[PDB]
Amino acid sequence: PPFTVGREDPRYIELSHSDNHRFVVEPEEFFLPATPDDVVASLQKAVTEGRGVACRSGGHCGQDFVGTPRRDLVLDLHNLHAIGPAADGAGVRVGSGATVDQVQKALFRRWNAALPLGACSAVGMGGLVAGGGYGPLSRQLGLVVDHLHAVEVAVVDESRTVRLVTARADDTGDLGELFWAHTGGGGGNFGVVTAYEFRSPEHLATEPVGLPRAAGRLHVQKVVFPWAMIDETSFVTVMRRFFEWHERHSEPGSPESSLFATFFVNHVSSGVLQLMVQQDADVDPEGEILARFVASLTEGTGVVGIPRGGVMSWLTGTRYMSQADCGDVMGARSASKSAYHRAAPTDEQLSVLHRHLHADHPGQASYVMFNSYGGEINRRGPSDAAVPQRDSVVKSSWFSAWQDAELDELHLGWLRGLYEEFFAGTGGVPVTGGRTDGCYINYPDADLLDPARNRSGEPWHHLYYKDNYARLRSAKRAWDPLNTFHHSMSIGL
Amino acid sequence: PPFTVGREDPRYIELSHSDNHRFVVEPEEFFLPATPDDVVASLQKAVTEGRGVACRSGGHCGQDFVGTPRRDLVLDLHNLHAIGPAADGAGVRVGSGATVDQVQKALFRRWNAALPLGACSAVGMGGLVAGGGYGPLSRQLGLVVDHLHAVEVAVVDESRTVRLVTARADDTGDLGELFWAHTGGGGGNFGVVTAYEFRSPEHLATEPVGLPRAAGRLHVQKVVFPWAMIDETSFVTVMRRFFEWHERHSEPGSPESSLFATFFVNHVSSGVLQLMVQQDADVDPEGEILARFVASLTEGTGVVGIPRGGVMSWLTGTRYMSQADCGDVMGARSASKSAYHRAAPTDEQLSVLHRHLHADHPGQASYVMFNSYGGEINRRGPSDAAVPQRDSVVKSSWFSAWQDAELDELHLGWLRGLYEEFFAGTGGVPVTGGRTDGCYINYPDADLLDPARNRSGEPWHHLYYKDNYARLRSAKRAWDPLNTFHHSMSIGL
Ligand SMILES: *Cc1cc2c(nc3c(=O)[nH]c(=O)nc-3n2C[C@H](O)[C@H](O)[C@H](O)COP(=O)(O)OP(=O)(O)OC[C@H]2O[C@@H](n3cnc4c(N)ncnc43)[C@H](O)[C@@H]2O)c(*)c1C
Ligand SMILES: *Cc1cc2c(nc3c(=O)[nH]c(=O)nc-3n2C[C@H](O)[C@H](O)[C@H](O)COP(=O)(O)OP(=O)(O)OC[C@H]2O[C@@H](n3cnc4c(N)ncnc43)[C@H](O)[C@@H]2O)c(*)c1C
Structure with missing residues (x-):
């Protein structure tokens, strides 16, 4: 009742x-x-x-x-x-x-x-x-x-x-x-x-x-890359390759649309970067596309990842790759920002990211998550639904979580500093219609309402909803x- | 339907x-x-x-x-x-x-x-x-x-x-x-x-x-202790003190019955031990018992823990301390053994435990978990319910999880080796009526059926159900x- x-x-x-x-x-x-x-x-x-x-x-x-x-x-x-x-x-x-x-x-x-x-x-x-x-x-x-x-x-x-x-x-x-x-x-x-x-x-x-x-089955893989093996140059290389793969392989209906990657690019205090990848095993029984994707990211570089995972049934595989309401994500204070990427960021932007990921900062739960996007999403037109972004290929979430209210300013400062410098060439936000295509309303960011944070001239409602x-x-x-x-x-x- | x-x-x-x-x-x-x-x-x-x-x-x-x-x-x-x-x-x-x-x-x-x-x-x-x-x-x-x-x-x-x-x-x-x-x-x-x-x-x-x-509210705390700061002697001391605290403070109705600790004593490859403690904040608003308990474990030793947590409402706090069906626990192969402890193990036993936690073994999900027990459990008589253990003060779970079937023998071997040596003085099992009181049927262990593993002469049904x-x-x-x-x-x- x-x-x-x-x-x-x-x-x-x-x-x-x-x-x-x-x-x-x-x-x-x-x-x-x-x-x-x-x-x-x-x-x-x-x-x-x-x-x-x-x-x-x-x-x-x-x-x-x-x-x-x-x-x-x-x-x-x-x-x-x-x-x-x-x-x-x-x-x-x-x-x-x-x-x-x-x-x-x-x-x-x-x-x-x-x-x-x-x-x-x-x-x-x-x-x-x-x-x-x-x-x-x-x-x-x-x-x-x-x-x-x-x-x-x-x-x-x-x-x-x-x-x-x-x-x-x-x-x-x-x-x-x-x-x-x-x-x-x-x-x-x-x-x-x-x-x-x-x-x-x-x-x-x-x-x-x-x-x-x-x-029927999913290939699921999680690969850990120790920060100690990554310098600025190899970081930029890996990140650039991640984005370029998506620029090439995000058309609706392609074989590569069966793959979805989540790259947790963690602050250095976490010690590691973590790449998660899943692929539909009905489409690709041997998981060849997944294996080639993962290998391609770090080839040539001196970076070696430690993989775990396997092939799982659907519900078990989905939970293996998911975050539930338990453990350290519970009762936390957090802030998140978002961006849609139509194309790779510049190497200069990737260097800015690297620098902030090495700042003296309590960043054990601070990271930027890059997710595969596009594919079937991009089959529809911008006005067919209220969601307007229909040609992006990577979606990013910029995140920090912490426990104490007294550290709100510290964490908000770190996140704002990173996001705003990364997008400094466009007013500190991922403006629409360029390398980026604005923001996702399910990761709402009230900073977009404030001129000190958003110098792009593009209002929140255009970043989220465009026309x-x-x-x-x-x-x-x-x-x-x-x-x-x-x-x-x-x-x- | x-x-x-x-x-x-x-x-x-x-x-x-x-x-x-x-x-x-x-x-x-x-x-x-x-x-x-x-x-x-x-x-x-x-x-x-x-x-x-x-x-x-x-x-x-x-x-x-x-x-x-x-x-x-x-x-x-x-x-x-x-x-x-x-x-x-x-x-x-x-x-x-x-x-x-x-x-x-x-x-x-x-x-x-x-x-x-x-x-x-x-x-x-x-x-x-x-x-x-x-x-x-x-x-x-x-x-x-x-x-x-x-x-x-x-x-x-x-x-x-x-x-x-x-x-x-x-x-x-x-x-x-x-x-x-x-x-x-x-x-x-x-x-x-x-x-x-x-x-x-x-x-x-x-x-x-x-x-x-x-x-109404729960104190919840998680404390991480780096293995690098712990030698055999301080390990034994911390473990002994954990058990002795429970020998003293597990009577039904005591103030200390508002506290529950879970000590994840991980294989060294995990890098840390992790102690979780929660306490009813209605009973103890300042959480003094929790703070004293935690401090007492390492007092004197050179071991320093890194705490996190706070005071949370009931449902959020319970989830913060809990394990859900998500992430790395999903799709895993595992083995678990159990023991009821009526009293502290000997220092010699604790040294055995220390040695196996340092064995050359892939132990990133291998651990012994020690949980507070007794209190209100111990109010009833052994024959009042089918569960017979009504005077124990710590309950332990001995656990390993892994991914590949080809490593079944390796992990079973590590777990069996540890449990059997730890309890070697009593046939390799936690016999009833001594320092231990048998096993818990919800952590069933088929090894108790094999004479190579159980040399105590006490059959599985007596270890689980006694009289x-x-x-x-x-x-x-x-x-x-x-x-x-x-x-x-x-x-x-
Ligand atoms: C915390 C969190 C959010 C995530 C995560 N992962 C996501 C992912 O992988 N894909 C995504 O597309 N989105 C992910 N999100 C974000 C969630 O999509 C957003 O945070 C949603 O808005 C959350 O919905 P809900 O959990 O219902 O949030 P509420 O706080 O209850 O409400 C948000 C907002 O919507 C209004 N509202 C809720 N319910 C209704 C109904 N029934 N009708 C109208 N309006 C409703 C609320 O009033 C409030 O305004 C991963 C994580 C960890
Ligand atoms: C996996 C796991 C188990 C845990 C965990 N934490 C525990 C805790 O903190 N306290 C505990 O007391 N126990 C914990 N356990 C152990 C579980 O209690 C045991 O593993 C339970 O037996 C699990 O119950 P359930 O999930 O229902 O397991 P099944 O595999 O479905 O059934 C086991 C056994 O019982 C029979 N059975 C199930 N359902 C019924 C019904 N309705 N009637 C009669 N028999 C039933 C099954 O046939 C089978 O024989 C933490 C973790 C991660």
């Missing part, structure tokens, strides 16, 4: 934290709905009484969107996690409170199916889907939103009336706009999503629920005219 | 692996029941046709019990994971397919409750509960079976008729025996459990559902007269 957790309830303390402990969520109360109807009734009460609301699914927000500005009510959606066949026609319905782990297990166990969900199994569908969603399978399957068929969402009209509407991929008029806005517009903007329905493009769909087939912002604003005016749903980086009326 | 996965189904490959990849589970088919009735109907069809059956919940078995001897049918129970208030009107019912993670989240989120479930969140309730179940909260709350109120189980009688029976803590006669047998008898022995109901002893129970209250074995055999004869449920270490008729 549905229940409420107030300020005096002992569970409030746990609920007041999302994953990123830099931020706190302190409403007058949390409501934990059990059904979409519970969501509607809860929102209706709140909006009628003029109370401020927000929702939360997995709590993975990189920013303080849920708890800031101060809310009277937060709807925590984790009980809405049902997964099942879609009521009408093929496809699959997923409650917005389901986590990636729950979805991956259900899709595989029930239908031998897979969607391109991310590498962190605790992420909630709510925010992940609304912002686009990419993962290890995206070079084969595209973005999660590329499989979206419908969104069921609680919305608030100009008369303060809450309705549960369902917008479908084949809708036109206002409903068509609401559907499109959820294909990358980002969470916290239009209403409270209660469920998503997924139906894959014809060329990716298989029986019996119209989703893609999970690979799709106008249509998003129209959808916002139409569907959330009172700006009921808002946060520091919400779509403007 | 319920479905079957046969040899030709692509999902069969994933299902053929449990957590420990040393073993394979290859039945003619897996059946995935959705309800207890599905279990009964599936078992009935199988036993009528003379087909061999076994079940699996979380897949965490340390041995090959599920897939060996060859089975015609394996019932995979993960869909039976419902959690809710007991129908009787008091307590909570938990499906046997629920994992520790599912149970911890549900108990906390719904009722601010907690049970002493283990430190690995992917373990299934099915096997965990039947074998006893201990965890970080056991010094306050006892074993999981100490909270068991009922077991709902599918059993097979002499006429090959399957019936779903519910045996309760207040039952007498045959049902009383069936209930008692599930309080430590171990999984795979009596029938297929479909659900457990939990109701805490009066002194531990709270509103609203008769379970214990989850602590409770006779009553277990009687229950087995009564409730599984055809030996439908059996494996390499199952209770004998």
Whole structure:
């Protein structure tokens, strides 16, 4: 059943934290709905009484969107996690409170199916889907939103009336706009999503629920490279080769689209760089492409990696390559920035990166992660979904995590220093339409709002949404005219 | 709904692996029941046709019990994971397919409750509960079976008729025996459990559902000690002090029972030892006991630890200290042995341990884990439940994990060499009734069946069940007269 957790309830303390402990969520109360109807009734009460609301699914927000500005009510959606066949026609319905782990297990166990969900199994569908969603399978399957068929969402009209509407991929008029806005517009903007329905493009769909087939086996490999064996020149060589491989091998449908690499380029205090690579073993039984990719990175250089891994079944291999809600990632303070890369950075940029990775800094959880991108993602056009980046080949995440609030300035300083110098030639940000193509709204970065940090002249909304912002604003005016749903980086009326 | 996965189904490959990849589970088919009735109907069809059956919940078995001897049918129970208030009107019912993670989240989120479930969140309730179940909260709350109120189980009688029976803590006669047998008898022995109901002893129970209250906050700390700073003498000193602290401070109800330590005493190739400690912050707001305990271990020695951690809310803190189904623990081959310690080992034993931790061996996932024990566990008498160890103060797990089948012998050899020399004075095993008290059935060790490995004259069933074995055999004869449920270490008729 549905229940409420107030300020005096002992569970409030746990609920007041999302994953990123830099931020706190302190409403007058949390409501934990059990059904979409519970969501509607809860929102209706709140909006009628003029109370401020927000929702939360997995709590993975990189920013303080849920708890800031101060809310009277937060709807925590984790009980809405049902997964099942879609009521009408093929496809699959997923409650917005389901986590990636729950979805991956259900899709595989029930239908031998897979969607391109991310590498962190605790992420909630709510925010992940609304912002686009990419993962290890995206070079084969595209973005999660590329499989979206419908969104069921609680919305608030100009008369303060809450309705549960369902917008479908084949809708036109206002409903068509609401559907499109959820294909990358980002969470916290239009209403409270209660469920998503997924139906894959014809060329990716298989029986019996119209989703893609999970690979029978995956090659999975993790290679550790000791920093002690790497000098600046070989670092630049390895990094350049990583990017150049992607420039060549990121076309939709190519054999190389079966491979996905994640390069953890760690601060030197970690002692090592770590390359993870996976490849669909159905496509390439011997894993030849993976082996050639890995070997090519360090050939000639004096750098020798220590590999581990093997060939695993799908669910076991996926978990081997994933990050769950356990251990040192829990209860941490963190900051992350993002960039889309259309082409290799210059060698000078790679030297800047090397220099900051050797700064005197407590960097045991500080790194830049470079992920393969493109492939099937790049089959669609920039305006087909709200996500506009459809010709990038590597996606980077720039990350630091730490424990003590007293070190916030230190860690934010290191991250900002690195990102801003790396992109100094373009105002300290990865501007669109050049070697880079802006940023990903699921790694939101409030520094992009500040002229001291962003001297590019390109506003946050263009870095995240490019030319799709106008249509998003129209959808916002139409569907959330009172700006009921808002946060520091919400779509403007 | 319920479905079957046969040899030709692509999902069969994933299902053929449990957590420990040393073993394979290859039945003619897996059946995935959705309800207890599905279990009964599936078992009935199988036993009528003379087909061999076994079940699996979380897949965490340390041995090959599920897939060996060859089975015609394996019932995979993960869909039976419902959690809710007991129908009787008091307590909570938990499906046997629920994992520790599912149970911890549900108990906390719904009722601010907690049970002493283990430190690995992917373990299934099915096997965990039947074998006893201990965890970080056991010094306050006892074993999981100490909270068991009922077991709902599918059993097979002499006429090959399957019936779903519910045996309760207040039952007498045959049902009383069936209930008692599930309080430590171990999984795979009596029938297929479909659900457990939990109701805490009066002194531990709270509103609203008769379970214990989850602590408001936990002190959590992880301390890393570099092997480079530790010589044999200081190693022995640290280990001795760890054990002596527990000899003094493991009485039921003491302030020190709010503390739980896990000491990962790693092979030298890992470079470090790691001590984890948590303490109930409601009991000890300043965490003085924790701070004193940690300081005492290395006082005098030249060993300096590097601490991290803090004070966290219950669910976040529990996850911070826990191991989930992700990363390097996935897809691995492993072997584990166990021992109950009633008193400190001799310094000579601790020197043996030191020597093997320095052996030329690939030991990056080889370690001995020492866990705080006793406290509330030790309130009950040895015959009150099927678990007989009720006066131990430290529990150890002796572990190695690796990837390649070709190294099975190497790793088994290292682990056997260490355990057998450490316990050489008592036949190579932790005999009962001395400095040690035998072994834990949830870390089953088939080596205890071989005279080359066990020269103590104490058979496996006495090491695990001591004087409770006779009553277990009687229950087995009564409730599984055809030996439908059996494996390499199952209770004998
Ligand atoms: C922490 C983390 C995030 C990751 C990780 N790995 C990713 C990957 O491999 N691929 C990716 O595409 N993204 C990865 N991400 C990022 C997540 O995609 C984002 O952090 C998501 O936005 C998280 O979603 P969720 O966990 O639901 O976050 P919340 O904090 O609950 O909400 C974020 C934001 O969205 C709004 N919102 C949530 N739910 C709804 C619904 N139901 N309807 C409307 N709006 C919703 C919130 O109010 C808030 O505004 C790996 C890691 C470790
Ligand atoms: C892998 C692993 C195990 C751990 C870990 N941490 C523990 C902890 O902190 N405290 C503990 O008390 N135990 C810990 N364990 C050990 C687990 O407790 C044992 O490994 C359990 O037996 C695992 O249970 P489960 O995951 O359900 O294992 P299975 O392999 O499915 O079954 C084992 C055994 O039991 C029978 N069985 C399962 N289900 C039932 C039902 N419903 N009814 C009767 N019999 C059942 C199986 O047939 C098999 O014989 C940490 C880690 C990483």
